[PDB]
Amino acid sequence: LSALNPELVQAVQHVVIGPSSLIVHFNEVIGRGHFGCVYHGTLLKIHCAVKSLNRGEVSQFLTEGIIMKDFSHPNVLSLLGICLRSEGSPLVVLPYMKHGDLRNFIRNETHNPTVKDLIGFGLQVAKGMKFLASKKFVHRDLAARNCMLDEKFTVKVADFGKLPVKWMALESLQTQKFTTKSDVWSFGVLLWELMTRGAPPYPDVNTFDITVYLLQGRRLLQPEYCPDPLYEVMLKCWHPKAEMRPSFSELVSRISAIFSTFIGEHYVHVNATYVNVK
Ligand SMILES: CCOc1ccn(-c2ccc(F)cc2)c(=O)c1C(=O)Nc1ccc(Oc2ccnc(N)c2Cl)c(F)c1
């Protein structure tokens, strides 16, 4: 529309994908959810994922896209480009992730992860977060459902895009303010999700009052296959004082030590009480 904002229109220019150099297979759907949608696509012939807005809002869309342009790290999802379709909503083009999101992947009964594999995934998320934190970028919705998994089993932190209260730090639930320290709280929950193989956090608890629940003096239970030292790390991520939580560099350090101790002998099986739980 150009009448959007010169500055943004120019920034989107250096990453523009000519509508003729990308084919969208609207027939082959991938994502599809509240607001936007995801489709398979070909780029010139690289396989890709094409995010669209099903819909001011277009501006936030393009804006969220431009920020991704500086995300260059093996553990952070990259942007191929943004295609300005002269027929509909602009599109965001992403590399194809053969294994989809991390939560659905670990939840799969046909998969046979070990303690080591799962800790490894957490290690990769932490590396991605460490990069993001160094760029002063606050995620706000860090969870296993927002982490992608490619063909080499490399984890990419992302955001599919009504608060995810169950991953939110105490101060954020109380204030609505987000920081890197509240991302650490979310990361601890992400660790729990991995070790439980994608179980829903606080099954019994209502979204409307996780705050009251947490203030009673509670935290998530140690999953059955979670090593003590990793649980000790989870509890640190959930420190009541935000400044007392470890940084992502510390987490990378600590988790990488725990990970090195395993050899791939301990298989992780789903909990019977968590099965089919929504
Ligand atoms: C308009 C802004 O869009 C953003 C903006 C910022 N970040 C962002 C936020 C924080 C970070 F640390 C890094 C990136 C994003 O991740 C996205 C996004 O669209 N992500 C997204 C994710 C999965 C998708 O689905 C795929 C994709 C590939 N392969 C498969 N199989 C599937 Cl299922 C998908 F299509 C789109």
CA of 149 to the centre of ligand 1 (A): 12
Pocket test for ligand 1, best of 26, 40, 77 (most atoms within 8 A of CB): 77
Among 3.60.20.10, 1.20.1630.10, 2.60.40.420, 1.10.510.10, name the CATH number for the domain at 97-275: 1.10.510.10
In sequence order, the β-bridge partners of residue 148 are: 101, 156
How was this one solved?
A: X-ray
132 lines ligand 1 (CB under 6 A): yes
What are the structure tokens assigned to 156, written together? 């990419």
Quick one: which H or E segment has residue 52? strand 46-52
User: Closest Cα to atom 21, ligand 1: which residue?
Assistant: 160
Cβ-contact 74, 132 below 8 angstroms: no
79 lines ligand 1 (CB under 6 A): no
In sequence order, the β-bridge partners of residue 157 are: 76, 147
User: Closest Cα to atom 14, ligand 1: which residue?
Assistant: 158
Burial class (CB in 10 A: 0-12, 13-18, 19+), 138: middle
- Could you tell me which of 179, 185, 129 has the C-alpha nearest to residue 156? 129
31 lines ligand 1 (CB under 6 A): yes
CA of 20 to the centre of ligand 1 (A): 22
What does the DSSP assignment read for 170-233?
A: HHHHHH----HHHHHHHHHHHHHHHHTTSPPSSSSS-GGGHHHHHHTT--PPPPTT--HHHHHH
- Could you tell me which of 240, 185, 179, 174 has the C-alpha nearest to residue 210? 174
The active-site residue out of 70, 101, 141, 159 is: 141
Q: What is the experimental resolution, given in Å to one decimal place?
A: 2.5
Dist CA 98 CA 101 (whole Å): 9
Cβ-proximal residues to 195 (8 Å cutoff; 6+ apart), any chain = 118, 223, 225, 226, 230, 268
Task: Say whether 141 is catalytic.
Answer: yes
Cβ-contact 96, 39 below 8 angstroms: no
Radius of gyration of the chain measured on its C-alpha atoms:
20
User: Which residues of the chain form CATH 3.30.200.20?
Assistant: 7-96
Whether 33 has a binding-site annotation, put simply, is yes
User: Which residues of the chain form CATH 1.10.510.10?
Assistant: 97-275
Using alpha carbons only, give the angle 164, 170, 176 rounded to the nearest 5 degrees: 60
Pocket test for ligand 1, best of 24, 58, 160, 186 (most atoms within 8 A of CB): 160
- Could you tell me which of 19, 152, 167, 16 has the C-alpha nearest to residue 74? 152
**Residues of 224-259 as b/e, b for ≥16 C-beta within 10 angstroms?**
ebbbeebbebbebbbbeebeebbebeebbebbeebb
Cβ-contact 91, 82 below 8 angstroms: yes
Which residue, chain included where needed, has tokens 């947490």? 214
Whether 61 has a binding-site annotation, put simply, is no
- Could you tell me which of 122, 115, 68, 120 has the C-alpha nearest to residue 95? 68
CATH fold label, 7-96: Phosphorylase Kinase; domain 1 (3.30.200)
Q: Which amino acid is at 103?
A: R
